[PDB]
């Protein structure tokens, strides 16, 4: 039995990438595959317990620790090449999350970078990391779509204004480290701002310092997004600056490896 | 501690790559580093036993050397090898050979590809070579030589001269290409000897045919030779008959160096 042949983005493609912070690849993944990774992540929700974040099951953290299916998503090799082509390094998992923006639901998210949390409360180096979010479903004009400053990254870490203690989280409405009205216009004056769209299966990658937001999803159907969060190897984490759980930050530094097509 | 982030391939190398069969990075190992690796050769030379072909090589070093073990997981090489095999990989086979001032025999055309499908059930050609330079590679000490795009029609006739394992270090080669195979496809492809400075690296395709004369040149022409193989393409060990140091079992992804404190 074959897998196709590792497929990795073309030299315009990472310009793209570099440069905007963020690309998007349509119909990485068939109805069928998505299927299977919705169906799994409404058994995450269901069974997640404190890795969960209610709105009412909004968000799960940490899925590919606990389930297999999303143990060897993390590994595909649809995303794997292409995280190892983009931070040049071996690489794993840093952070696994999934946010479901039902019809008619949703909050406004705050513009923050990635970067920032990781940095501050996890250890992380670097910016030497990235996401790929997966389409579970198309994301369009009026369904809450991730939207980005791009370009937004090239300026590294914005200062932000610490708000809560304890575990920080990107998922919880009052993030502890939001951005700077004043900061925000300028770098929206500069570089604009754009809502990435596509079909359902496609993966978004971007940044983990490029500033983000979303709103409410006004249409009748569901916006759910998996992203996976791969960090260089050499960029691994310091454990002894961190303390969050390993669901919401990793330790475990194992440079992963591709899954191959067996007979199960 | 930093290693300089992973280099791959650009587009116009790949394709060269992919058209000729072979290609040379020059200057990727500095020289102290091929010091390091002339050094390790030698030691191979000396305690390989068995692993010795007599001294014309050694096989399977990245298995008893941990310098050679780390080697096969340098930066400088692991990433092309994925690239260009465009899946994680393993190493099928390690060996040095060593063709010393103005000695060593002809080596005969051959196709390392079908002596690993026969030998060793490797399914297909899906496997590459990378040959580092330990002293410079010139016109007159024996360069490997090859036809370029040689690789293109797949595996090419050859007769079964042994019993045994085959071996790829001897001027007598189990699966040799007689002069009527080669007098074609050199008229139409011809013949290309890549050259280059001590610390570059050769790659060069499972299936590309290729050849060698002796050194007759007061300077040695040392080469240390790994072989990746795609996990997919991984060879079958019930076809199989060879040493674990001739055709490797265990298929484990390799995985980069990274740069530690010792």
Not at 10 to 20: F, G, I, L, T, W
Not at 170 to 185: F, G, I, P
Request: glycine share 8%; aromatic share 10%.
């Amino acid at each position: 039995q074959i897998m196709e042949p590792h497929d990795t983005l073309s030299p315009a493609q990472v310009d793209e990438y570099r440069k905007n912070g963020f690309l998007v690849q349509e119909h990485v993944f068939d109805e069928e595959e998505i299927e299977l990774l919705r169906a799994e992540a409404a058994q995450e929700f269901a069974s997640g317990g404190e890795r969960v974040t209610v709105e009412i099951v909004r968000g799960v953290h940490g899925c590919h620790l606990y389930s297999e299916v999303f143990g060897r998503l993390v590994r595909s090799p649809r995303l794997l090449p292409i995280a190892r082509q983009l931070l040049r390094d071996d690489v794993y998992v840093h952070q696994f999350k999934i946010n479901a923006k039902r019809a008619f639901k949703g909050e406004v998210w705050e513009w923050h970078q990635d970067y920032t949390f990781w940095h501050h409360e996890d250890g992380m180096p670097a910016p030497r990391a990235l996401s790929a979010a997966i389409f579970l479903d198309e994301v369009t004009e009026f369904n809450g779509p991730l939207t980005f400053v791009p370009g937004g990254h090239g300026s590294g870490m914005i200062d932000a204004d610490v708000k809560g203690e304890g575990w920080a989280n990107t998922l919880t409405a009052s993030l502890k480290y939001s951005l700077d009205v004043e900061t925000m216009r300028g770098l929206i004056e500069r570089n604009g701002m754009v809502a990435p769209k596509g079909p359902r299966g496609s993966v978004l990658w971007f940044d983990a310092n490029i500033p983000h937001s979303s709103v409410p999803n006004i249409s009748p159907f569901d916006r759910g997004l998996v992203l996976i969060t791969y960090n260089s190897v050499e960029n691994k984490t310091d454990v002894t600056r961190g303390t969050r759980p390993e669901w919401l930050a990793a330790r475990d530094f194992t440079p992963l490896t591709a899954l191959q097509a067996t007979s199960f």
